Amino acid sequence: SEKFAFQAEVNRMMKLIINSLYKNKEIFLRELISNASDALDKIRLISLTDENALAGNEELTVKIKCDKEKNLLHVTDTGVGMTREELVKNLGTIAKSGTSEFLNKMTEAQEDGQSTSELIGQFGVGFYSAFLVADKVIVTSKHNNDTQHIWESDSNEFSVIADPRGNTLGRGTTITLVLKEEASDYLELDTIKNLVKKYSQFINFPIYVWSSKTEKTVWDWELMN
């Protein structure tokens, strides 16, 4: 277990973003899906140049799941996944070149009143919008060149620890959200299914949502796109 603090710029960008979308929280799910999407492309492309790319988990899916009892929301993809170093640099710092660009474009557009929603998605920095509805955000990730790890933060800091459960993902990443009190509605299946459906009609991968039929009840992944 090792704790860290966010780069300054990432603290600023976290706020802009939480500010930009303050009245359209639902967008946090749009992004979490996009990211997943991107992650799955990453590996697919990689499967072109490597015969063992999918050896860890032969699937390429995105699977949402609500846990009302424990107040949790999960969004797992069998994408490329992240190594320990990337969890710390990609989430805790301004690693890319296009991220700095977004910090500038965002402040210039936000000042002249122009639409920003598109900016966040444009530069894929949408991950931080998860703090709009979550008190705690946890990212479990297994990548082919490392072991499984856990990242967790309440935005005031973050920490990374190797996952004591061992490689349970195969390959991929799980974004676990500890929902705020005012977001307990995102735990309702019907609410989640419409939002997932609404933001995945452009994903090149199948997106499932652990659902119930129903007293006899049957639970199973339901294809949404």
From Swiss-Prot:
Tissue distribution of the protein: Detected in heart muscle (at protein level).
Mutagenesis / variant outcome for changing residue 31 to A: Loss of ATPase activity
Origin superkingdom? Eukaryota
Chain positions recorded as ATP binding sites:
35, 77, 90, 127
Coiled-coil ranges per UniProt = none
Sequence positions bearing N6-(2-hydroxyisobutyryl)lysine:
96
Glycosylation: which residues? Answer: 35, 145
- Where does this protein reside within or beyond the cell? Endoplasmic reticulum lumen; Sarcoplasmic reticulum lumen; Melanosome
Q: How is it modified after translation?
A: Phosphorylated by CK2.
At which residues is Phosphoserine found?
100
What remark about domains does the record contain?
A: The SRT pseudosubstrate motif associates with STT3A during translation in normal conditions, preventing glycosylation of facultative sites until HSP90B1 folding is completed.
* Sequence similarity: Belongs to the heat shock protein 90 family.
* Main function: ATP-dependent chaperone involved in the processing of proteins in the endoplasmic reticulum, regulating their transport. Together with MESD, acts as a modulator of the Wnt pathway by promoting the folding of LRP6, a coreceptor of the canonical Wnt pathway. When associated with CNPY3, required for proper folding of Toll-like receptors. Promotes folding and trafficking of TLR4 to the cell surface.
Instruction: State the oligomer form and interacting partners.
Output: Homodimer; disulfide-linked. Component of an EIF2 complex at least composed of CELF1/CUGBP1, CALR, CALR3, EIF2S1, EIF2S2, HSP90B1 and HSPA5. Part of a large chaperone multiprotein complex comprising DNAJB11, HSP90B1, HSPA5, HYOU, PDIA2, PDIA4, PDIA6, PPIB, SDF2L1, UGGT1 and very small amounts of ERP29, but not, or at very low levels, CALR nor CANX. Interacts with AIMP1; regulates its retention in the endoplasmic reticulum. Hyperglycosylated form interacts with OS9; promoting its degradation by the endoplasmic reticulum associated degradation (ERAD). Interacts with CNPY3.
Which protein is depicted?
Endoplasmin
> In which organism is this protein found?
Canis lupus familiaris (Dog)
Annotated gene: HSP90B1
The shown chain, on whole-protein numbering, covers 73 to 337 of 804
